[PDB]
Structure formats: C-alpha cells, structure tokens
Amino acid sequence: LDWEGRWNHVKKFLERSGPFTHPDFEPSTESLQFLLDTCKVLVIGAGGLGCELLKNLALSGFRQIHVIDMDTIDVSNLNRQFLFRPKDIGRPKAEVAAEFLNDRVPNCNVVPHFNKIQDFNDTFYRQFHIIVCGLDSIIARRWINGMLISLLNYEDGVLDPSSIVPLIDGGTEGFKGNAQVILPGMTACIECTLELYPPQVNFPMATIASMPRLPEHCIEYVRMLQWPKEQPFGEGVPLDGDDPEHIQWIFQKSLERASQYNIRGVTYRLTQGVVKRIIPAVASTNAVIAAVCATEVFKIATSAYIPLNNYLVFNDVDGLYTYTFEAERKENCPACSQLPQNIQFSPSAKLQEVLDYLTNSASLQMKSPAITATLEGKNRTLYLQSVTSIEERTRPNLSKTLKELGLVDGQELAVADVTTPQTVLFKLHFT
Amino acid sequence: SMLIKVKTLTGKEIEIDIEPTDKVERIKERVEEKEGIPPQQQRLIYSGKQMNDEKTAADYKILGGSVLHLVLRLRGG
Amino acid sequence: KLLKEQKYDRQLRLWGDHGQEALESAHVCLINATATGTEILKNLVLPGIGSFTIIDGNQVSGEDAGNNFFLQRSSIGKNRAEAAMEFLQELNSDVSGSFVEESPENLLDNDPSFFCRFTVVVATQLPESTSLRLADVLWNSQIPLLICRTYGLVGYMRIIIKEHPVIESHPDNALEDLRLDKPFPELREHFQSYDLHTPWIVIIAKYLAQWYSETNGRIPKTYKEKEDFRDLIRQGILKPEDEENFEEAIKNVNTALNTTQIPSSIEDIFNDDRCINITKQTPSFWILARALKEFVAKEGQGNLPVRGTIPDMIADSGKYIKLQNVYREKAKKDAAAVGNHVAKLLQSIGQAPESISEKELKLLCSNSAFLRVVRCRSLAEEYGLDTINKDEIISSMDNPDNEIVLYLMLRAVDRFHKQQGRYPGVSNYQVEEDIGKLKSCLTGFLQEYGLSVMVKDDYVHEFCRYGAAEPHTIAAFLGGAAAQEVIKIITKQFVIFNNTYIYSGMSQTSATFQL
Ligand SMILES: [Zn+2]
C-alpha cells in the first residue's frame, strides 16, 4: 500500500481537468491506481539514460517495469549511473538496477532481463504499452524500430490503432542530447530521421599506416594492423578494450609509432578513447533527456497532456538551448512505408549496383543486406551475406542482370539485414 | 537576394545571403563561411522538413524572413 | 589514487584534470532538500564535488518521501535536510555532506555571513520573499547564487553572478586561425620554400601568390573571385585523373581565405573599464585582458596571438608536422610577448611578476578569441519598479505562448501567495474558487509594473491545476540542467546562461531571458 500523500505530486494531473489536457482525457480518481497496476513499460538499456529513466518512471506512478540490458557493471560507469556502487562492479546492470530501485522505491516491480534486445521477438514486445530507449549504438535504435513496426496490424489497408506501441527514444553525447517520440505508422520512425546523425570519421586506410599526422593515426594503426600482425597474448586472441593490459601494450606500441613520425599527442586516455570509441559522458545531460522522456511516457499513458510532436535537441555548452520540432515522416521510408518501395532500374544493370544502393544510399543505409526473390515459383536467395558459406554460393550472381536471373519487373524484393528484424519489401521497375 | 537567418545549436542566430535558386548545399557553406561549422555535419530544418542539400531554397519555400535551425542527433546513453 | 582516474573518466574528457581539480575543491550549499534540490545535488555528488551542505528546516512529509529519490518512507516526520543527506552521501564516498536543521529564513537573520564559505549557493522552492533577501545578502558578499524552482510542469532557473569571466569557453565550432590574409614571417617562409600531397594550406598559399601577382596584390573577395580562384586551382592538377588534396583545397577556399580579424566580443572586453583601469584590486582575468590588449597594439600588429593549431589535412607525414610546428612555434612566441606585458602590468600595479602562472598565459593565448564575460543583473534590479526589463517581457509576449507567460504566471502566483498565505489550488476544493483570485493577482501584478500584455486565460486555469506540485520528472530536468550550470561556475569552464531559464514540460520547450 501507499502512505498518505505519496502520490499527490501526480494526482493533480490525473484527478483534474485542464486546458492543455489531451482531448481523450478523463479526470478521474481511479486513474492512478489503474496506472500503477496495469501499465506495463519496457525500458531498453540500463546505464546513463537507463538508470535515470527507471528512477523517473518509478516516482511518476509507474510500477510494472521491465529493463533489458546485456551489460556488466564497470568502473567508468559509476560517475553517472547512480544505481551502481563499486561493490556492485562486475555484476549485470539490469540485475543490480532493479535490485536498487525495487528497494529504494517501496513497491516497485522492476523486472530485469539480462540479455541482447535481439534475443526477444514480437511475442515479447507485443506485451508492453510503451517502450523507452537509452541505447548507445545506432543499430539497436534501428533494430528495435523495426520490431515495433512489425507489430503494426493493418486491418485491410486501414491501420488498427490498438497495435501501435509508443516508442520514446533518448540519446546523449557529452553536453548534447536529444529525445524523440515515435508512434509507429503515424509519426516519423527512427529510419525516417536516420539522417540527422553525424558522419562517422573513417580514417582513410592510406594515412593510417603511411601518412600518420595525428596521435589517433598512431593508435588506429597499433590496433587495426600491428596487433593482428603480432598477437601479443597468443595467436587468435582478440584485442580486449576493457583489458588494462592490451591498452598498455597498445599505448606502448603507439608511443613507438608516434615517435617514429614525431607526432606528439599520444597518451593513455587518448589511446583508451581510440581503441574503445569512447564518448565523454556526464550525469547531468542524462538526467535531462531521461527526464524529458519520462514526462512523455507519463503523458502517453495518461493523456494528461499532448505528447511531444516529434523532436527535441538539447545543448548545455553555451548557456541552455533546446529546439523542438515536428520531424516529417517520409512516405517512401523503407521501414514505415505500409507498402513496398519503387526502385527505378534498367534490367541491364548488374546486381552489385543494386546491393550497394542499399548499402550506400544515405536514405536506406544497411550494413550487410541480403536480397531474395521468388523465381521458379520458389524463393531462391539471389544473395545473402551472413554465413560465409552462402555468400560464395551466391557471389557469382552479383554480376548477372535483372533479365539475367529471371527478374521481370513488377516483382517484390525481400531484403533482410542486421539493422532491422523485419523483411523490407520493394517493387522492381524497368527503365 | 533575399536575406535569411539560421540558428546555431546554441541559439546563436546568424544572417545569410541566399537567392531562391541557390542549393541547400550552398547555404551550409555560407554558414561555415561565417561560423566555422563543417557543412558535412549540418542538419538544417525548415517547417520540420530536414532540408535535403541537393534541392534548393526555393524548393522548401524559403523567403525573406525565414529562420532555419541546425539540429543534431546523438548516439550515446 | 589512480582509482579515481578510472571512475571519473567519461567526464575528465570534458573538463580535464584541472577541471576535476576545481570541482573537488568546491563546496556547495543547497537550500531546500526537495526533489529539485536533491536531484541537483545528485549530479554534483556523482561527478565528485568537493563537499556539500544542505540547509533545510522543514520536516519530511508523505509527499516528500513520495517524489524524492533520496528520502524514504522511514524518514517522514524527520528533518528533511538531515534525512536527504544520508542518502545522497551514499552516491559517493569522496563527497563531504553536512546539514543545517534550520530554515533559510532563520540563517539569513542570525548568520547572514554563513554563506561566504560556499563556492556557490543553490536555492530551490523558495517563496518570493526569502529570495529577495538571500539574493541581496549574497549579492553583497559576492557569492554566486542560483535560484531553481519547479512548479507543475514549469521549471525555473535564475542565475545571479555580478561577473563571470571565462577563458576556456569550449566553443563547439570556430574558424581556424590560419593567417593566410595576414601571414607572419615564419609562415611566409614555409610557403616560398616550395615548388621543387602538400597540405592544402600551402596549395592555397602558392596559388594565392599567383593570383596576388596578376591583380596587384588583390586577394579574392567577391563570391565570384573566390569562385574563379577555384578554377585557377583545378587547372594545376598534374596529369592525375586523381589528386584528392587538390579538391580538398578548393573546398577550403570557402573558409581559408579571410580567416583573420578580432572577434566582436573581444573588442568590448578591451573596451571595458575593468580592462582600461587597472588597480591592485583588478582580478587576474582583467590583468591578462590588458596584457592581451597591449599585444594587439604592439607585437600583435592589430590582431590577437596566433591560436597555434590547424585542422587535419590530407598530406604527407613529415610535411604536416613541419607546417604544424610553424604555428605551434609562432604561438609559443606570441604567448611570451603577452607574458612580458603581463609582468610589466603586474609591476605598474605593484604585484609579484609571478602572480600569473605560465599555464594560464599558455591557455589565455590559446583561447584569446574565445574569452567571454557574463554579467548578471541583481535580483533586486529585476524586481524593482524602475529597473524591471519591461522591454524584454513585452517584446517576448508578442507570441501568446512564449515561455515567458510562465514567468509572469509565476509572479502572479507569488503575489497570490503573499496575499493569501497559500499557493493557488493545492486542494481540489480550491481550484474553482482560486482561478478568480489568481486572475486578479495576475492583473494586480501587471498593472503595478505597467505591462500591457495578453495572458490567455487558459494559463490561469493550468497554474491552479498544478496545485504547486513538484512532479519529479520536471524536477529531474532542472536537476540536470542546473547541476551543470553549477559546474560551469565551479570550473569556470563553459559559458553560463544569462538570466532566467524557463522550461515548459507541457510543450517540452525552453527559452532564456535577461530580466
Ligand atoms: Zn519511417
């Protein structure tokens, strides 16, 4: 039970009518109890935003919460992931976090899930009412975006609203952060705005081991080449970023490479940063995004106010700045599109020039797609790329053509990728 | 030449000279010209549409008193 | 020892070791242990703040235990200050907690000087009254004050520091200090010493000497000249149906050309009285400012010291490190010149030449075009009948929904509180009745300062709906935002907002005003 006054800071918004209230709103004195009991919410990620989100959700009237995180507690976490003490190092974040939370907040029912978000399938996600992110890789944001979309049920052309699972996403990176609110098949998805991301600084292979002019070049080498060419800890043994010894060996073999081309600037911290692609992080920014996102989860579950139309960006560096706007949902979008994609392509063109279209077009950017079609009344894998075995069995067909493999325009094209759980469909068009 | 304003990711607003026919690809250079922000990381937005730097200011119906915002997304968490 | 370097890592890459150093020397004071305060202290304790003191007199209540992540059911009835300190204390064994079982009002009357011991004071949920006093006392003893407040979905932050001068402002972007338009000797050499991938800087340098010749030294200016200056470059690609760095030059033409001139904001510092009139009283920032101003008129030849850094470039190794060293070495000189002026200045004033260290001087010059000075108007000024910044408020209101409505509403609500002894709408039975009285107070307020502004009646309803609640998520927000504003203050490292920061949880939007 709840002690006197425990939720007054919430009841104001559920028991009272308001001008800025969402239209479906209904002031009631039973709302809070209902929220507390039935509203199931899934929190993806439990570090930085994850910790902050669980606290925020718990104190906002949420009780039925699950958290998925495949990570282990580390020392560096401790400066911004307040649910972990040093005693808890080594344990699984997801576990320690529900532990702490369930303890600090009286009757919380935080359920931990120690695993990759990819071990679960629609069956599992279909059960939540709102899902909140706090991932730290773009791919995961991508993956869980498709998953939520695949759950969309179209009642013959028309969408069935009761199958839309709201997805709030957070992102942090130094004194900068942002949050989005997604309504699968209604609002812009993660794909629809995949371009708002920055470019990835890919050191040109040449300079890395030829024209090194920066301390990073004199590390990217000692990692991308010299280590493989001299297994320091037995052949086949991988470079373990979290191992203070491989860093030392890399830092050491970095000083030497730096010294060779007289490039000052090599240091342990810089070496640790290159080898692990570290992103400077403070607790402050995470408290902010996680705060915004929680307020949306609250809004979305209660109808106390109108949920953020699309996007929020935040910057702490020079004063305080935020910009909110309504990102557009692309009607062409590989993900969102309730229908296939029309691809202009002369039946003369080769495969590679259609594979790389998926691999290189900045609007659809996949890491390793694998197309397939229906040819002799049976689905043949034109090209798959996952298991080394099939790539070679299909690698030859990457020279053929559309009239070459039996591809007559008008037929769909199932494309699968690591990026998303669903199978993206297209429509061939010969020009 | 119609004069438009664009906002830094800190709120700082700068004025730029753009004529209805100059690509978005150029506006970004005008901004870098004045602010030192590499065009390769600028995300412009007008009316919520993220201005594709291949089309042109006219395409996005940009006019005299038009404010654009530089946005961004983040990976960490 | 090294054990800290490991946990405080992800932030050391933001404010360095010197930053962390300050942070660990600071001592912060939080007025109310509410969720807002509690959260703000949570983001300072985690990063390693030296020590903190909580001054709360109220007793923990049911609501207190319910929205605060640092007060459990078990502390209800107990001293909120003490109770929250024990929980916060756990977040980091390197932080020294303390508390004062008195209220802010009591201290302001019996030991006003007590706050001199703090680096910064953070006040939360204070009634209008108490603030005006706290802000006054502190303004006089020169203690940075930061007033934070959570009201319904409205977050409020008011920073009050008479002067906050910053050297290392950490700008997210800026034009490179290449100096192609006003090239120094060394540079002038490293260029003519070519002909017989080469940083695009040189590429632009040479094809510049050429254009300079056939134009009677006339640097490309027009968006045409720059455009033609570009073709005058493509036309030198040797036979290569590939020569990357040559296109990676034509692109810099947009920038690289005119990349020299003193920042408009640095002028004003030079022009500020604090810089013009030096006395032993003058703080070292301004001393350095003058030294920097002297350089300009003398060995600087009109411009600030050379920054001494250049952008990465597609080029040969030993060729880059050579060019890099030109600037890296010119900058080190200028630094020395500006160091001369400093000690001459320190002498004229009569302080020890070694008053200012070289680390500083080294950092000052590296950041000469990035210095920033922030001055806040005292709270008394904002509240004064003749000093109120009406032009800011009226101008902002042109949009009925500009965050500033919430400011004004907050003022009506305090006016209501002064007059009624209570906040509007706390109990459900009062919401209907109070809307009228709040509307009247809003008008009582607006008339008193004489501000003709339209406030959608819908805002009066909402603020009563709010019942002066302190919903956690709104509090968490402020917690994060303010926490960093405190750290900026302590490390003197980034740039603090100027006056009033208002965040609207309803629309998830925010803005900054100078009041
Ligand atoms: Zn989409």
Tab-separated table of C-alpha atoms in Angstrom, chain C residues 61-439:
chain	number	residue	atom	x	y	z
C	61	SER	CA	6.165	14.623	4.802
C	62	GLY	CA	4.303	11.994	2.836
C	63	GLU	CA	4.661	13.810	-0.485
C	64	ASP	CA	8.312	14.427	0.318
C	65	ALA	CA	9.017	10.720	0.622
C	66	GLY	CA	6.947	10.062	-2.488
C	67	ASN	CA	8.673	12.230	-5.108
C	68	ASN	CA	12.211	12.339	-3.737
C	69	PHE	CA	14.612	9.542	-4.628
C	70	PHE	CA	16.618	10.470	-1.537
C	71	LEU	CA	14.027	10.279	1.254
C	72	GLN	CA	12.273	7.043	2.152
C	73	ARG	CA	9.009	6.316	3.855
C	74	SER	CA	11.022	5.858	7.022
C	75	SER	CA	12.152	9.455	7.277
C	76	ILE	CA	8.690	11.039	7.312
C	77	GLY	CA	8.440	13.466	10.186
C	78	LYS	CA	12.249	13.782	10.383
C	79	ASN	CA	14.465	16.704	9.351
C	80	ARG	CA	14.347	16.748	5.576
C	81	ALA	CA	17.841	18.219	5.382
C	82	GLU	CA	19.464	15.578	7.545
C	83	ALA	CA	17.469	12.699	6.019
C	84	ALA	CA	18.352	13.538	2.411
C	85	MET	CA	21.981	13.996	3.289
C	86	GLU	CA	22.342	10.398	4.382
C	87	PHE	CA	21.026	9.024	1.100
C	88	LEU	CA	22.909	11.455	-1.077
C	89	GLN	CA	26.038	10.746	0.946
C	90	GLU	CA	25.993	7.139	-0.350
C	91	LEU	CA	26.314	8.143	-4.016
C	92	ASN	CA	29.994	8.977	-3.494
C	93	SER	CA	32.363	8.312	-0.573
C	94	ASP	CA	34.587	11.188	-1.781
C	95	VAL	CA	31.936	13.865	-1.096
C	96	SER	CA	31.600	15.502	2.311
C	97	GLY	CA	27.998	16.021	3.329
C	98	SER	CA	26.787	18.345	6.087
C	99	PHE	CA	23.486	19.836	7.095
C	100	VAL	CA	21.797	22.570	8.998
C	101	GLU	CA	18.458	21.826	10.662
C	102	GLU	CA	17.429	25.443	10.251
C	103	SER	CA	15.478	27.168	7.506
C	104	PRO	CA	16.946	29.642	5.020
C	105	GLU	CA	14.921	32.352	6.694
C	106	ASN	CA	16.490	31.643	10.092
C	107	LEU	CA	20.116	31.786	8.793
C	108	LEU	CA	19.551	34.963	6.835
C	109	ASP	CA	18.627	36.623	10.122
C	110	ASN	CA	21.113	35.149	12.535
C	111	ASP	CA	24.248	34.332	10.477
C	112	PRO	CA	23.976	36.003	7.048
C	113	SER	CA	27.733	35.660	6.648
C	114	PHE	CA	27.470	31.876	6.852
C	115	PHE	CA	27.285	31.611	3.053
C	116	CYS	CA	30.741	33.164	2.472
C	117	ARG	CA	32.143	29.696	2.984
C	118	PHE	CA	30.486	28.406	-0.188
C	119	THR	CA	31.662	28.446	-3.812
C	120	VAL	CA	28.032	28.572	-4.985
C	121	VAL	CA	24.626	28.533	-3.339
C	122	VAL	CA	21.702	26.681	-4.897
C	123	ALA	CA	18.227	27.561	-3.616
C	124	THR	CA	15.116	25.596	-4.503
C	125	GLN	CA	11.385	26.104	-3.885
C	126	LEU	CA	11.876	29.423	-2.074
C	127	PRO	CA	8.963	31.827	-1.617
C	128	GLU	CA	9.320	35.208	-3.361
C	129	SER	CA	10.116	36.957	-0.066
C	130	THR	CA	13.052	34.787	1.101
C	131	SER	CA	14.652	35.017	-2.325
C	132	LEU	CA	14.819	38.765	-2.452
C	133	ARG	CA	16.724	38.611	0.843
C	134	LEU	CA	19.005	35.720	0.032
C	135	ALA	CA	19.802	37.253	-3.354
C	136	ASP	CA	20.613	40.538	-1.581
C	137	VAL	CA	22.896	39.191	1.153
C	138	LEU	CA	24.736	37.005	-1.300
C	139	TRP	CA	24.949	39.732	-3.925
C	140	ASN	CA	26.776	41.892	-1.378
C	141	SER	CA	29.251	39.242	-0.206
C	142	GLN	CA	29.699	38.150	-3.819
C	143	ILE	CA	28.637	34.529	-3.622
C	144	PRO	CA	27.227	33.106	-6.859
C	145	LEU	CA	23.569	32.280	-6.316
C	146	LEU	CA	21.356	30.060	-8.424
C	147	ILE	CA	17.607	30.043	-7.734
C	148	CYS	CA	15.816	26.948	-9.047
C	149	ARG	CA	12.121	26.237	-8.904
C	150	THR	CA	9.721	23.527	-10.012
C	151	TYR	CA	6.029	24.418	-10.325
C	152	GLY	CA	3.680	21.966	-12.013
C	153	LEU	CA	5.339	21.378	-15.346
C	154	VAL	CA	7.261	24.630	-15.129
C	155	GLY	CA	10.966	24.635	-14.309
C	156	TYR	CA	12.620	27.917	-13.331
C	157	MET	CA	16.290	28.838	-13.036
C	158	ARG	CA	17.684	32.271	-12.292
C	159	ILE	CA	21.414	32.731	-12.165
C	160	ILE	CA	22.865	35.684	-10.283
C	161	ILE	CA	26.590	36.397	-10.542
C	162	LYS	CA	27.720	40.011	-10.885
C	163	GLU	CA	30.628	38.948	-13.055
C	164	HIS	CA	31.700	35.594	-14.516
C	165	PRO	CA	34.779	35.899	-16.743
C	166	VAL	CA	35.736	32.790	-18.671
C	167	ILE	CA	38.889	31.910	-20.623
C	168	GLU	CA	38.346	28.320	-21.692
C	169	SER	CA	34.787	28.692	-23.102
C	170	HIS	CA	34.949	25.457	-25.134
C	171	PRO	CA	33.302	26.665	-28.359
C	172	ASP	CA	31.629	23.886	-30.387
C	173	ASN	CA	32.947	25.428	-33.639
C	174	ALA	CA	35.113	28.269	-34.943
C	175	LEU	CA	37.125	29.367	-37.956
C	176	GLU	CA	40.703	28.118	-37.940
C	177	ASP	CA	43.373	30.709	-37.181
C	178	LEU	CA	45.378	30.023	-40.333
C	179	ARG	CA	46.518	33.555	-41.173
C	180	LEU	CA	46.639	33.450	-44.952
C	181	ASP	CA	45.376	37.021	-45.200
C	182	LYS	CA	47.867	38.424	-42.669
C	183	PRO	CA	50.682	35.793	-42.828
C	184	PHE	CA	53.502	36.030	-40.312
C	185	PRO	CA	57.229	35.739	-41.217
C	186	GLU	CA	57.788	32.048	-40.411
C	187	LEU	CA	54.641	31.177	-42.344
C	188	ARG	CA	55.720	33.441	-45.211
C	189	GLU	CA	58.846	31.237	-45.416
C	190	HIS	CA	57.413	27.735	-45.172
C	191	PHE	CA	55.464	28.722	-48.315
C	192	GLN	CA	58.090	30.171	-50.646
C	193	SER	CA	60.124	27.127	-49.638
C	194	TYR	CA	58.080	25.036	-52.053
C	195	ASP	CA	57.861	24.090	-55.757
C	196	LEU	CA	60.704	21.628	-56.419
C	197	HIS	CA	50.212	15.839	-51.188
C	198	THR	CA	51.126	19.027	-49.704
C	199	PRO	CA	48.899	20.471	-47.066
C	200	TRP	CA	46.080	22.292	-48.838
C	201	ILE	CA	47.178	25.308	-46.759
C	202	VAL	CA	50.310	25.565	-48.894
C	203	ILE	CA	48.338	24.713	-52.024
C	204	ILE	CA	46.084	27.701	-51.307
C	205	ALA	CA	49.168	29.675	-50.285
C	206	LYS	CA	51.008	29.358	-53.575
C	207	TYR	CA	48.062	29.659	-55.942
C	208	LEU	CA	47.445	32.751	-53.816
C	209	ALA	CA	50.794	34.361	-54.613
C	210	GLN	CA	49.939	33.809	-58.239
C	211	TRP	CA	46.504	35.429	-58.048
C	212	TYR	CA	48.072	38.149	-55.897
C	213	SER	CA	50.501	38.970	-58.732
C	214	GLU	CA	48.002	39.208	-61.617
C	215	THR	CA	45.707	41.517	-59.602
C	216	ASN	CA	48.223	43.934	-57.970
C	217	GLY	CA	48.094	42.039	-54.731
C	218	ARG	CA	44.342	41.770	-54.666
C	219	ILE	CA	43.013	38.929	-52.542
C	220	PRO	CA	39.892	37.271	-53.852
C	221	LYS	CA	36.891	38.947	-52.255
C	222	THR	CA	33.740	38.501	-54.362
C	223	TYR	CA	31.852	35.231	-54.366
C	224	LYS	CA	32.947	35.391	-57.995
C	225	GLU	CA	36.652	35.959	-57.323
C	226	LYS	CA	36.634	33.114	-54.850
C	227	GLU	CA	34.773	31.069	-57.457
C	228	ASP	CA	37.342	31.825	-60.181
C	229	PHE	CA	40.209	31.424	-57.703
C	230	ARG	CA	38.858	27.869	-57.521
C	231	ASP	CA	39.226	27.038	-61.213
C	232	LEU	CA	42.656	28.645	-61.072
C	233	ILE	CA	43.372	25.689	-58.828
C	234	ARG	CA	41.779	22.764	-60.634
C	235	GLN	CA	43.958	23.934	-63.511
C	236	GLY	CA	47.127	22.603	-61.940
C	237	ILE	CA	46.162	19.056	-61.144
C	238	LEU	CA	49.062	17.426	-62.685
C	239	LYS	CA	48.257	14.753	-65.206
C	240	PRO	CA	46.290	12.885	-62.413
C	241	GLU	CA	42.832	11.787	-63.252
C	242	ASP	CA	43.103	11.639	-59.355
C	243	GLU	CA	44.628	14.270	-56.989
C	244	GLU	CA	42.483	14.354	-53.849
C	245	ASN	CA	44.122	17.031	-51.700
C	246	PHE	CA	43.579	19.417	-54.609
C	247	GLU	CA	39.813	19.208	-54.340
C	248	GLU	CA	40.287	19.229	-50.548
C	249	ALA	CA	41.652	22.721	-51.079
C	250	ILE	CA	39.151	24.183	-53.476
C	251	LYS	CA	36.668	23.401	-50.710
C	252	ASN	CA	38.580	25.341	-48.075
C	253	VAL	CA	38.538	28.375	-50.345
C	254	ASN	CA	35.100	28.983	-48.859
C	255	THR	CA	36.801	29.298	-45.474
C	256	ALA	CA	40.615	29.521	-45.566
C	257	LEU	CA	40.742	32.892	-47.403
C	258	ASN	CA	39.652	35.527	-44.921
C	259	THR	CA	40.341	33.873	-41.525
C	260	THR	CA	41.798	36.815	-39.563
C	261	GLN	CA	40.247	39.661	-37.549
C	262	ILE	CA	39.465	40.325	-33.856
C	263	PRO	CA	36.156	38.873	-32.525
C	264	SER	CA	33.449	41.483	-31.949
C	265	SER	CA	33.016	40.269	-28.367
C	266	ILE	CA	36.719	40.533	-27.565
C	267	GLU	CA	36.649	44.207	-28.582
C	268	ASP	CA	34.186	45.059	-25.864
C	269	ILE	CA	36.357	43.389	-23.230
C	270	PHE	CA	39.281	45.526	-24.445
C	271	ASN	CA	36.872	48.473	-24.271
C	272	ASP	CA	35.562	47.636	-20.793
C	273	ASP	CA	36.546	49.931	-17.988
C	274	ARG	CA	37.719	46.925	-15.932
C	275	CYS	CA	40.415	46.400	-18.601
C	276	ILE	CA	41.230	50.083	-19.129
C	277	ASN	CA	41.577	50.906	-15.439
C	278	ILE	CA	43.921	48.585	-13.598
C	279	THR	CA	44.446	48.638	-9.837
C	280	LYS	CA	45.823	46.074	-7.367
C	281	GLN	CA	42.122	45.276	-6.929
C	282	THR	CA	41.721	44.167	-10.550
C	283	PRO	CA	41.367	40.360	-10.774
C	284	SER	CA	43.879	38.413	-12.889
C	285	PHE	CA	41.403	37.925	-15.737
C	286	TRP	CA	41.374	41.641	-16.479
C	287	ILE	CA	45.136	41.927	-15.983
C	288	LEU	CA	45.546	39.263	-18.654
C	289	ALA	CA	42.920	41.071	-20.694
C	290	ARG	CA	45.030	44.231	-20.731
C	291	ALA	CA	48.201	42.277	-21.493
C	292	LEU	CA	46.288	40.821	-24.407
C	293	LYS	CA	45.163	44.335	-25.435
C	294	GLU	CA	48.773	45.586	-25.376
C	295	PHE	CA	49.917	42.765	-27.617
C	296	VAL	CA	47.309	43.870	-30.134
C	297	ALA	CA	48.604	47.407	-30.411
C	298	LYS	CA	52.236	46.210	-30.407
C	299	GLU	CA	53.900	42.908	-31.492
C	300	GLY	CA	50.439	41.664	-32.464
C	301	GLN	CA	50.178	44.168	-35.297
C	302	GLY	CA	46.455	44.624	-34.876
C	303	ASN	CA	45.493	41.052	-34.106
C	304	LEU	CA	45.370	38.637	-31.185
C	305	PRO	CA	48.084	35.987	-30.607
C	306	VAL	CA	48.202	33.127	-33.122
C	307	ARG	CA	45.941	30.321	-31.896
C	308	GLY	CA	48.609	27.802	-32.823
C	309	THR	CA	46.610	24.882	-34.164
C	310	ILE	CA	45.477	23.763	-37.575
C	311	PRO	CA	42.844	21.356	-38.930
C	312	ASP	CA	43.874	17.860	-40.011
C	313	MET	CA	44.832	17.600	-43.667
C	314	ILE	CA	45.308	15.006	-46.394
C	315	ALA	CA	49.066	15.220	-46.667
C	316	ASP	CA	52.496	13.670	-46.232
C	317	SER	CA	53.592	12.919	-42.653
C	318	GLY	CA	56.849	14.806	-42.161
C	319	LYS	CA	55.276	17.540	-44.310
C	320	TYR	CA	52.368	18.101	-41.907
C	321	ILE	CA	54.398	18.013	-38.707
C	322	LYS	CA	56.573	20.720	-40.259
C	323	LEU	CA	53.691	23.102	-41.018
C	324	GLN	CA	52.076	22.237	-37.714
C	325	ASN	CA	55.253	23.304	-35.944
C	326	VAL	CA	55.261	26.674	-37.718
C	327	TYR	CA	52.133	27.818	-35.890
C	328	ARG	CA	52.842	25.737	-32.800
C	329	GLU	CA	56.088	27.758	-32.650
C	330	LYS	CA	54.761	31.169	-33.637
C	331	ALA	CA	52.054	30.812	-30.959
C	332	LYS	CA	54.604	29.912	-28.314
C	333	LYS	CA	56.399	33.177	-29.154
C	334	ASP	CA	53.385	35.442	-29.000
C	335	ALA	CA	52.491	33.791	-25.718
C	336	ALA	CA	55.892	35.025	-24.448
C	337	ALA	CA	55.257	38.581	-25.701
C	338	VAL	CA	51.889	38.646	-23.943
C	339	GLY	CA	53.701	37.293	-20.896
C	340	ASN	CA	56.070	40.265	-20.977
C	341	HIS	CA	53.216	42.773	-20.916
C	342	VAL	CA	51.643	40.859	-18.029
C	343	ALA	CA	54.605	41.297	-15.681
C	344	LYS	CA	55.088	44.936	-16.757
C	345	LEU	CA	51.410	45.422	-15.941
C	346	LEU	CA	51.734	43.470	-12.686
C	347	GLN	CA	54.618	45.801	-11.825
C	348	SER	CA	52.862	49.066	-12.675
C	349	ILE	CA	50.233	47.765	-10.259
C	350	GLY	CA	52.797	46.510	-7.802
C	351	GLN	CA	52.179	42.754	-7.575
C	352	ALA	CA	54.730	39.916	-7.894
C	353	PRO	CA	55.624	39.210	-11.566
C	354	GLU	CA	54.909	35.541	-10.807
C	355	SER	CA	51.334	36.401	-9.799
C	356	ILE	CA	50.099	34.869	-13.038
C	357	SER	CA	51.449	31.419	-13.971
C	358	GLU	CA	52.518	30.286	-17.410
C	359	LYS	CA	49.897	27.556	-17.603
C	360	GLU	CA	47.347	30.351	-17.547
C	361	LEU	CA	49.187	32.528	-20.025
C	362	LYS	CA	49.526	29.473	-22.255
C	363	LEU	CA	45.770	28.823	-22.015
C	364	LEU	CA	44.824	32.504	-22.377
C	365	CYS	CA	46.548	32.906	-25.733
C	366	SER	CA	45.266	29.558	-26.973
C	367	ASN	CA	41.816	30.933	-26.245
C	368	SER	CA	42.311	34.636	-26.991
C	369	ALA	CA	39.410	34.779	-29.437
C	370	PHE	CA	37.111	32.778	-27.169
C	371	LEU	CA	37.075	34.750	-23.941
C	372	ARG	CA	33.629	35.511	-22.577
C	373	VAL	CA	32.352	37.710	-19.779
C	374	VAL	CA	28.918	37.325	-18.285
C	375	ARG	CA	27.285	39.862	-16.013
C	376	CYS	CA	24.008	39.304	-14.265
C	377	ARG	CA	21.515	41.870	-13.190
C	378	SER	CA	20.850	41.603	-9.447
C	379	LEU	CA	17.546	40.086	-8.442
C	380	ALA	CA	16.672	43.415	-6.841
C	381	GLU	CA	17.098	45.052	-10.248
C	382	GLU	CA	14.740	42.608	-11.951
C	383	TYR	CA	12.105	43.105	-9.234
C	384	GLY	CA	12.462	46.915	-8.998
C	385	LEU	CA	9.641	49.159	-10.220
C	386	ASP	CA	12.015	51.312	-12.258
C	387	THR	CA	14.618	48.725	-13.203
C	388	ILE	CA	12.317	45.972	-14.458
C	389	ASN	CA	13.203	44.990	-18.018
C	390	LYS	CA	9.749	45.625	-19.433
C	391	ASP	CA	11.028	45.775	-22.962
C	392	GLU	CA	12.149	42.174	-22.702
C	393	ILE	CA	8.833	40.937	-21.270
C	394	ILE	CA	6.538	42.890	-23.604
C	395	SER	CA	8.590	42.048	-26.654
C	396	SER	CA	8.596	38.332	-25.818
C	397	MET	CA	4.844	38.201	-25.263
C	398	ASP	CA	4.118	39.027	-28.895
C	399	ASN	CA	3.640	35.277	-29.000
C	400	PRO	CA	0.870	34.385	-26.515
C	401	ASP	CA	2.665	31.136	-25.843
C	402	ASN	CA	6.225	32.294	-25.347
C	403	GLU	CA	7.673	30.589	-22.283
C	404	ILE	CA	7.655	33.980	-20.563
C	405	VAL	CA	3.932	33.570	-19.807
C	406	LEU	CA	5.034	31.054	-17.231
C	407	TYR	CA	7.361	33.680	-15.747
C	408	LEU	CA	4.536	36.139	-15.331
C	409	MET	CA	2.240	33.383	-14.053
C	410	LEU	CA	4.908	32.514	-11.511
C	411	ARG	CA	4.860	36.181	-10.425
C	412	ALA	CA	1.091	36.204	-10.100
C	413	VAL	CA	1.321	33.030	-8.082
C	414	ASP	CA	3.795	34.587	-5.668
C	415	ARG	CA	1.635	37.697	-5.466
C	416	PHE	CA	-1.205	35.314	-4.707
C	417	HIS	CA	0.869	33.584	-2.062
C	418	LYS	CA	1.828	36.841	-0.372
C	419	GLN	CA	-1.775	37.919	-0.289
C	420	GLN	CA	-3.441	34.573	0.511
C	421	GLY	CA	-0.898	32.852	2.704
C	422	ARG	CA	-1.093	29.814	0.413
C	423	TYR	CA	-0.432	28.640	-3.153
C	424	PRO	CA	-3.364	28.513	-5.559
C	425	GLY	CA	-5.117	25.200	-5.964
C	426	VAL	CA	-3.294	22.971	-3.506
C	427	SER	CA	-6.585	21.288	-2.539
C	428	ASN	CA	-9.112	20.170	-5.139
C	429	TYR	CA	-11.885	22.156	-3.446
C	430	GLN	CA	-9.978	25.389	-4.090
C	431	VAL	CA	-9.245	25.076	-7.807
C	432	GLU	CA	-12.574	26.547	-8.947
C	433	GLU	CA	-12.570	29.350	-6.352
C	434	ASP	CA	-8.877	30.193	-6.806
C	435	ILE	CA	-8.961	30.757	-10.548
C	436	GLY	CA	-10.658	34.074	-9.942
C	437	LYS	CA	-8.248	35.222	-7.245
C	438	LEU	CA	-5.228	34.175	-9.332
C	439	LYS	CA	-6.529	36.077	-12.379
